Design a protein around this nucleic acid. Structure first.
Ligand SMILES: Nc1ncnc2c1ncn2[C@@H]1O[C@H](COP(=O)(O)OP(=O)(O)OP(=O)(O)O)[C@@H](O)[C@H]1O
Ligand SMILES: [Ca+2]
Ligand SMILES: [Ca+2]
Ligand SMILES: [Ca+2]
Ligand SMILES: [Ca+2]
Length: 901
DNA sequence: CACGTAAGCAGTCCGCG
DNA sequence: GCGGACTGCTTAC
């Protein structure tokens, strides 16, 4: 097999590499790598190395890496560019793996672990590690086993062994319901003292050294706790055994408000699952507890226990251990679904970077572009300092707030990467500038043609047309990968809808789900078999189709993220290829493209309708337009349609056969006007929206920019079994909006769009009447809580104190003195509730850690003093008032002459 | 900790005769 | 009582 790296480090003048050899074995080597860097040289000097601008360079070979680093410093002292890859381990990987890396995940040791630490005096700070580690569960992907290290004797209590028999049993048998599928995979090791536990864990770690190390909050808690505890008990040298190269560093992670400390373990790649989830999931969650995320992702119930976690080991050690094991398993289950480890490996090996560098698109693209240029013996420029400067972004059209009955939307494929490719935007393809006219002059095609030689953006920039830049070349490769995965995602989505339709008429039979590949549209034979299946098999098939869709989503959306981040990185001062000329060339071209096509679509539809000056495009944001289809429907007449699906088909055909060709013609003209390298502005129909045929539903509405709702029947070729609400920006979509309020507002919107005013009024009246019965957590607002200390003046709100911070300070006074009470952690999220006048808390609101029940000492008082009136007005009535006034209808029935008879 | 900008709403402070 | 200036937070793209 082809060899591949596992980890790489620079330690002094040595590269330390763990890798899989040509026989599939894990090996480690220390290499005295001699790096090369580059200086410009006379044109008269013969060389094969050239910088990206075509200027010749001499290669400087250094005796060691420290010599190379010192040379860079000298070159700065002299005032001369030091060219080449200054991160020597990336150069090492490039030299050692000079081909497309094919990796075998089965050979990569992926470890998932979680620790327990009983603490009677509040949160056990990892920097102090003053409390015993009393449980570790460590899952190893190569063994497929859960290794459980269980401390039976502690200063906080002596306990009996954990029983695997009780663990397997149902909660109703007094058991812990550890999933039957992992029971046989548990290797249980009890210990009569903590020193013995930790020494054995380290021996185990040496035998089974993680390559990828993950878990939940492992980087911020588990790793620093274990390291510091071992350091405290045994000394530094023993703690450093967590690194295969016995090297660690305390790393200070700094933000805008403060800083925290993590432990870098050289020769390990830590991918904390909470950070993978935050970067790659495209959610914003009210809480990031594992319990909360597991419920959201997997629909598994809360791990229930009595009393504080600080007393769980003493009171119920059996449950304590079982829950530690389940915690580790839940992360594996989340990964089986979301597949972020697979994503990181894919991206990391593609770029030839340390796998943990996938968090950084700047590092990822630096390596991709470096490897690409190196293939041609080209030499990368030195990174430079730049001051941070603001620059313009996208255009967003101001919509007229209204209901909109029939709507068809259109959207440009991968816009910013497509602009880069079309225009040929790259550091080395800059050809010069032209004199810029106001943007509106280009939009209306009245400005002088920018160039007859070069490819142009309306920000004034010109680019070469003779050859692709490295940025277009490399962005295209990842774009093409993305396109493949999006194909699979949409097929699985369409396949899901087939199954949903068949579920209307399930068969009374005992059968099995079909063995099919959900990434490909179901054949006719499969469709006929599906129509004969039981509900049990159909539901299992739906679950599998949906899992395939999620896998495709992860793969496609994060490749989209990577390529969009390259466009963004051109506007980040730390990117080697930072250039506001290129960043603005992309964004200004985008503004033109949207407004150009707005004009073209209006012109086309005014022509076919026989009108003049009528605005068919009602809205647009960045790269999308929303077209009113009312006049199109009215031209055939609503009464001519058999059912909803009939007019959806008609609009689909109209969009495909009439509008898209006109849009294409419009963009080809724009490409010629800008003299671009390649026409890549591909704007396809996205959504078809409208009320159910024969209903009083309004179809859709806009309140403002980035705030709208549509009743969608077809999205990007997926014809839904049931209409789907596309809601953007509105409070139903915000993590800050209470859970039950999101749900209620969504139903209000559904009724507005599908059923009409009377239906909306009926639901509002009921919600208003019943909402006080809702669980307090379900009606609590949510906010991130930054700068608590800034606004804290003797326990009370300082000037300009934000509402949620005020709530935290209220909470802090109420729990004062308690070492046990849950503390609000700076930078994390809180639930927030308003408090009625004259409450014993002394202020108008209270806040507590999100994803938790408020502590029992004040729970009863919070419940008694919760201000339901304020809660309803702020989270529900105010947003609903906005939706309904925009839509020109009332959530309460107005008086009429009919009242009364 | 980790790519970019546009832009919405909650809330504070305080003007507005 | 609303709105501008401002901070804070959160989405859409
Ligand atoms: N997370 C992001 N970071 C940087 N730029 C972004 C991001 N999201 C969107 N953009 C910019 O807005 C443009 C339009 O965004 P949109 O979400 O429509 O996706 P797209 O890139 O056009 O891909 P698709 O093919 O899925 O439409 C992008 O091309 C770019
Ligand atoms: Ca725990
Ligand atoms: Ca798009
Ligand atoms: Ca059937
Ligand atoms: Ca879009």
């Amino acid at each position: 097999m082809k060899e591949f790296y596992l980890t790489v480090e620079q330690i002094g003048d040595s590269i330390f590499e763990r890798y899989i050899d040509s026989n599939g074995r894990e090996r480690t080597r220390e290499v005295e790598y001699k790096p090369s860097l580059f200086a410009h040289c006379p044109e008269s000097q013969a060389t094969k190395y050239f910088d990206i601008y075509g200027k010749p360079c001499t290669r400087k070979l250094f005796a060691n890496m420290r010599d190379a680093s010192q040379w860079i410093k000298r070159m700065e002292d002299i005032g001369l560019e030091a060219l080449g890859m200054d991160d020597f381990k990336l150069a090492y990987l490039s030299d050692t793996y000079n081909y497309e890396i094919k990796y075998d995940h089965t050979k990569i040791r992926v470890a998932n672990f979680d620790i327990e630490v009983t603490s009677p005096d509040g949160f056990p700070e990892p920097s102090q590690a003053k409390h015993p580690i009393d449980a570790i569960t460590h899952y190893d992907s190569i063994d497929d086993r859960f290794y459980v290290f269980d401390l039976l004797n502690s200063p906080y209590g002596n306990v009996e062994e954990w029983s695997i028999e009780i663990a397997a049993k149902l909660q109703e048998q007094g058991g812990d319901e550890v999933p039957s599928e992992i029971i046989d995979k548990i290797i249980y090791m009890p210990f009569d003292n903590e020193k013995e536990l930790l020494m054995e864990y380290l021996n185990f770690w040496q035998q089974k050294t993680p390559v990828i190390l993950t878990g939940w909050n492992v980087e911020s808690f588990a790793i620093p706790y274990v390291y510091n505890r071992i350091k405290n008990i045994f000394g530094e040298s023993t703690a450093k055994r967590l690194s295969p190269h016995r090297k660690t560093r305390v790393k200070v992670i700094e933000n805008m408000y403060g800083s925290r400390e993590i432990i870098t373990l050289f020769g390990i790649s830590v991918l904390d699952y909470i950070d993978l989830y935050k970067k790659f999931s495209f959610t914003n969650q009210p809480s990031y507890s594992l319990d909360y995320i597991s419920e959201f992702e997997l629909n598994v119930g809360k791990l229930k226990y009595d009393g504080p976690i600080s007393k769980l080991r003493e009171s119920n050690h059996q449950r304590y251990i079982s829950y530690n094991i389940i915690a580790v398993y839940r992360v594996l289950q989340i990964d089986a679904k979301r597949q972020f480890i697979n994503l990181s490996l894919d991206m990391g090996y593609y770029a030839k970077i340390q796998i943990q560098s996938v968090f950084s698109p700047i590092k990822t693209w630096d390596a991709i572009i470096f490897n690409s240029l190196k293939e041609q013996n080209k030499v990368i420029p030195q990174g430079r300092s730049h001051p941070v400067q603001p620059y313009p972004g996208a255009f967003v059209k101001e919509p007229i707030p209204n209901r909109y009955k029939y709507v068809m939307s259109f959207d440009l494929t991968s816009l910013y990467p497509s602009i880069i490719r079309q225009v040929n935007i790259s550091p080395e393809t800059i050809a010069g500038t032209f004199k810029v006219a106001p943007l509106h002059d280009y939009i209306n095609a009245v400005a002088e043609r920018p160039s007859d030689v070069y490819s142009c953006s309306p920000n004034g920039m010109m680019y070469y047309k003779d050859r692709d830049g490295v940025v277009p070349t490399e962005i295209t490769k990842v774009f093409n990968q993305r396109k493949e995965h999006k194909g699979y995602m949409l097929a699985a989505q369409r396949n899901g809808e087939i199954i949903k339709e068949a579920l209307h008429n399930p068969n009374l039979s005992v059968d099995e789900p079909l063995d099919v590949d959900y990434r490909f549209d179901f054949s006719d034979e499969i469709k006929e078999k599906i129509k004969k299946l039981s509900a049990k098999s159909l539901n299992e098939m739906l679950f599998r189709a949906q899992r395939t869709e999620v896998a495709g989503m992860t793969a496609q959306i994060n490749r989209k993220l990577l390529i969009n981040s390259l466009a963004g990185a051109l506007g980040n001062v730390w990117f080697r290829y930072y250039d506001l000329r290129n960043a603005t060339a992309i964004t200004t071209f985008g503004q033109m493209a949207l407004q150009w096509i707005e004009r073209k679509v209006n012109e086309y539809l005014n022509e076919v309708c026989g009108t003049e000056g009528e605005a068919f495009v009602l809205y647009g944001d960045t790269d999308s337009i929303y077209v009113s289809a009312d006049k199109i429907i009215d031209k055939v007449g609503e009464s001519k349609f058999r059912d909803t699906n009939h007019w959806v088909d008609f609009l689909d055909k109209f969009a495909r056969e009439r509008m898209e060709p006109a849009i294409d013609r419009g963009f080809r003209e724009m490409c010629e006007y800008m003299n671009n390298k390649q026409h890549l502005m591909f704007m396809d129909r996205e959504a078809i929206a409208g009320p159910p045929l024969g209903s009083k539903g309004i179809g859709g509405f806009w309140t403002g920019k980035k705030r709208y709702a549509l009743n969608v029947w077809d999205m990007e070729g997926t014809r839904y079994a049931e209409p789907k609400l596309k809601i953007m920006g509105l409070e139903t979509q915000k993590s800050s909006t209470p859970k039950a309020v999101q749900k209620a507002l969504k139903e209000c919107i559904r009724r507005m769009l599908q059923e009409g005013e009377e239906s909306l009024q009926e639901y509002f009246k009921e919600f208003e009447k019943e909402f006080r019965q809702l669980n307090y957590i379900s009606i609590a607002s949510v906010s991130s809580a930054n700068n608590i200390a800034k606004y804290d003046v003797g326990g009370f709100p300082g000037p300009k104190c934000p509402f949620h911070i005020r709530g935290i300070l209220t909470y802090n006074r109420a729990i004062k003195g308690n070492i046990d009470a849950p503390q609000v952690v700076e930078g994390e999220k809180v639930y927030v509730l308003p408090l009625r006048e004259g409450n014993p808390f002394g202020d108008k609101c209270i806040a507590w850690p999100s994803g938790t029940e408020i502590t029992d000492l004040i729970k009863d008082d919070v419940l008694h003093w919760m201000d339901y009136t304020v809660l309803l007005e702020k989270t529900f009535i105010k947003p609903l008032e906005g939706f309904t006034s925009a839509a020109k209808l009332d959530y309460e029935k107005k008086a009429s002459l009919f009242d009364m008879f």
